[PDB]
């Protein structure tokens, strides 16, 4: 389990886990880039539109997406 | 630690961990600029340099983190 947790933390630090920054403020949606292995693009935004709301495209954090998401979830 | 792992698994099974898929390289859905969500469920989007519009993919509702880890370890 410790090896898996270390691998997950390392992936989070490297920006390999694209976790949405939702627990607002619209942000940039940068161009599409493919990953190291695969033809699928790496996501850059978290656009979401409510039934009676507007666009909220908040960019995915690069430093710690999963860590920042968990901190925001705990703080809210 | 183990309790935290089980809590993360429980949150991921319920879809509360929005680890979103790698956007497919070939999506045929009509779209536009990301600031105009023409698609809306919470989706991960990237601006496609070809047409200038955004390619989006909704977050999996069953196991988002698990599916992402499976697809990361499958390549």
């Amino acid at each position: 389990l410790l090896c898996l947790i270390f691998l997950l933390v390392l992936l989070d630090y490297q920006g390999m886990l694209p976790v949405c920054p939702l627990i607002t403020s619209t942000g940039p949606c940068r161009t599409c880039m493919t990953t190291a292995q695969g033809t699928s693009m790496y996501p850059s935004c978290c656009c979401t539109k409510p039934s009676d709301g507007n666009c909220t495209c908040i960019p995915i954090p690069s430093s710690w997406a999963f860590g920042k998401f968990l901190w925001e979830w705990a703080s809210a | 630690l183990l309790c935290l792992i089980f809590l993360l698994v429980l949150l991921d099974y319920q879809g509360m961990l929005p680890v979103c898929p790698l956007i497919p390289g070939s999506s045929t859905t009509s779209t536009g600029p990301c600031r105009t969500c023409m698609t809306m469920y919470p989706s991960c989007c990237c601006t496609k340099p070809s047409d200038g519009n955004c390619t989006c993919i909704p977050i999996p509702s069953s196991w988002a983190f698990g599916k992402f880890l499976w697809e990361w370890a499958s390549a």
Partner: antibody
Amino acid sequence: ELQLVESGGGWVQPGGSQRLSCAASGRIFRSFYMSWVRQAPGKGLEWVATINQDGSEKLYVDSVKGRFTISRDNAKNSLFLQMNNLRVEDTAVYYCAAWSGNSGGMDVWGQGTTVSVSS
Amino acid sequence: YELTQPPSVSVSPGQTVSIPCSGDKLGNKNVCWFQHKPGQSPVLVIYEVKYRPSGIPERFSGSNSGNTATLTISGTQAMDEAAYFCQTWDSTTVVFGGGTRLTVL
């Protein structure tokens, strides 16, 4: 960062052919859309071509439609534009541009090569 | 598809200017603003309607009202004297503006 260097631009008779090669300086080149944009003398920037990461999606401007062919060697980290049946109006400084994932446009550019298609 | 820019604009040594960029329904498109100094490769200044890349000074700003994009430079210095091109996609082909050679006295 990522650095692009253009080469192969030079004089060529009208109706001739050229192969402009853009050498990158990183392995991240394979993860970016690669485009060719020209600036003609006395005019502004004009897009020429665009190719995706895998090379399966190639887009050209209508002026060079069919005449030009953009193709990339990801293993060699290079981006070539083969110009066939050049014209007098194709004289321009050509830049290769990288659609980096840290910007919504092409924020990486090369020095450019001055293709001079004239008699 | 055509993007219409002024041929050139005049700037005081420390004043703010706004380079417009006309178009057909530019409110539904992403407009990227570049900076092509003579003899140098173009520099991306703004990659969205209003968002700047890393390293570009905060003086540049972007806006998109109606069918008109705009690049506003506040506190323009002598290092902003260049040609600024607004870039947007028609269907799958990117289109640049005619150029706006900024002049700073």
